[PDB]
């Protein structure tokens with residue numbers, strides 16, 4: 001049956017939710033913390049803002065719901081519930097997404113406690129386990145950074161935030177964490193990117209866990225490229241060919257050639273195995289970076305690697321991405337997905 005819903009205003013916005021969700025408290029679409037009386041879980045309830053305002057917004061709402069509906073993995077955000085107060089398609093205008101409530105993110109950790117090498121092993125292991133799963137479905141996160149890695153008191157980690165609105169040019173400008181973890185090829189639009197961009201971000205994140213400092217805190221895209229090439233060396237002829245942008249290729253060739261630095265001297269005191277893994281992640285040529293599946297088998301993770309407990313994902317059909325639909329068609333597809341949702345056990 002349809003649950004009974006109740007309404008409340010929570011600063012400037014109307015929330016209409018099933019009775020099971022109690023004690024809604026704004027924390028961040030808008031997000032409310034709540035108590036799920038049915039499961040006994042503390043939950044986050046996100047009310048999507050203006051979900052079908054334009055074609056681009058209706059498609060993004062569909063995308064985020066598709067992605068969240070698919071993720072069933074211990075180290076990736078999962079959907080506990082999705083609902084609408086609407087009783088039919090004709091009256092459908094609001095989408096609410098429910099997930100486990102997350103206390104802290106990796107920023108809260110890296111910043112407010114010292115991480116042993118064993119903590120770095122555990123945290124990075126879990127990121128790579130979630131990424132093996134995400135990548136096996138041909139999903140690219142594209143925006144891995146400490147603020148979208150939730151971490152509980154047992155150091156257990158989930159990857160959050162996919163299907164999100166693409167960052168504006170302004171949001172990627174200047175001295176900003178929104179860009180510090182991005183692979184160079186996507187930061188500078190060197191070429192068609194793929195899932196290897198996520199591995200670059202893990203390397204940036206792992207080095208920050210080890211040193212307590214951002215690896216590439218560029219003050220703008222160019223300063224950041226310079227920080228990156230200082231560590232990993234300027235590109236060779238082979239990588240230059242793969243840079244399809246004539247302009248970017250030409251700029252990068254204006255730079256004084258530099259060799260790759262010795263990472264043992266950059267990451268002083270680090271476990272030599274961590275150093276080795278960082279060298280295999282932070283390779284400029286994305287073709288040559290270690291994959292998530294490969295990294296799980298790296299000796300740095302000996303204590304955690306269990307090849308029988310590193311699952312892959314069911315197939316994920318994203319043919320919708322290439323489809324051109326009207327707002328109401330994207331909105332009808334989303335409604336189908338709300339209506340057919342089945343909670344996890």
Ligand SMILES: Cc1ccc(O)cc1Nc1ccnc2cc(-c3csc(C=O)n3)ccc12
Nearest residue numbers: 027028031044045046100101102160161162
């Ligand atoms: C609801 C949702 C759905 C999808 C997604 O990718 C992210 C979210 N947002 C969140 C999920 C889980 N926990 C969250 C926790 C917060 C939050 C911000 S301060 C705080 C303190 O309790 N909690 C904000 C958003 C969250």
